[PDB]
Amino acid sequence: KNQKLAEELYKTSCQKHFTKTEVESLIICYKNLLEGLKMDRNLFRDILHQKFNMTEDLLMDRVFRAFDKDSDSYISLTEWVEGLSVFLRGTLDEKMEYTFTVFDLNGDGYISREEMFQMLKTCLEGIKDLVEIALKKMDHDHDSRLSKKDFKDAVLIEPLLLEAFGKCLPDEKSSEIFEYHVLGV
């Protein structure tokens, strides 16, 4: 019902950070918010806005897209749980994997200057400077763009650039409030 559902999702999801009863709590939550309705871009937009204090149109579309793995324009239960696992309790690897996906605006496998300009602006002229810093202080093949390895493998040795890219993630305050209310931590 809710507990049979929790069972099936704990069994099948590639979510790594939540116990099964925490999963049950996240299903109850999904249903209280929707009530049969499939969670779509609008509703997801409000959750990011009201519960997690994201303001930018472009940012919130990009977050919606990273959660919507299957690209059907709905965050299923599975995608809610999976995305919330990363989004609230993600390891560095997952966060960077997610951030790269948030930032790669055409899915070519690389973050270009133009991409990096647009996404750092909306996340946050020092934005242009930052874009040159990141490119300079990261890659082996300096070709004005950053492969997935260049992003991940570099940020490891300049932390503060992580945090410019990590406005695609909730601040500490939003996460504790959410985790408190919904999960009970």
Q: In sequence order, what are the residues at sequence separation of 6 or more whose Cβ sits closer than 8 angstroms to the Cβ of residue 76?
A: 38, 39, 70
In the block, tokens 């990096």 appear at 116
Nearer to its own copies, 75 or 164 (CB): 164
- 82: amino acid identity, one letter: E
> Please, are residues 15 and 82 in contact by the beta-carbon 8 Å criterion?
yes
> Please, are residues 22 and 182 in contact by the beta-carbon 8 Å criterion?
no
Q: How far is the CB of 137 from Mg ion (least distance, A)?
A: 12
d(CA 14, CA 1): 21
| Binding string, residues 86-125; x marks residues near its own copies by CB under 8 A | ------x---------------------------x---xx
Q: Per CB under 8 A, does 63 bind its own copies?
A: no
- Per CB under 8 A, the segment of 4-12, 32-40, 77-85, 159-167 that binds its own copies is 159-167
> Quick one: the chain helix, strand, coil %, rounded to 5?
65, 5, 30
Nearer to its own copies, 143 or 171 (CB): 171
- Per CB under 8 A, the segment of 3-11, 57-65, 69-77, 126-134 that binds its own copies is 126-134
Q: Per CB under 8 A, does 185 bind its own copies?
A: no
Q: Would you call 172 exposed, middle or buried from its count of C-beta atoms within 10 A (0-12, 13-18, 19+)? A: exposed
- Residue 143 contact partner, candidates Mg ion, its own copies, none, CB within 5 to 8 A by sort of partner: Mg ion
Q: Per CB under 8 A, does 127 bind its own copies?
A: yes
Q: Per CB under 5 A, does 132 bind Mg ion?
A: no
User: Which residues contact its own copies (rule: CB under 8 A)?
Assistant: 92, 120, 124-130, 132-134, 137, 157-165, 167, 171-172
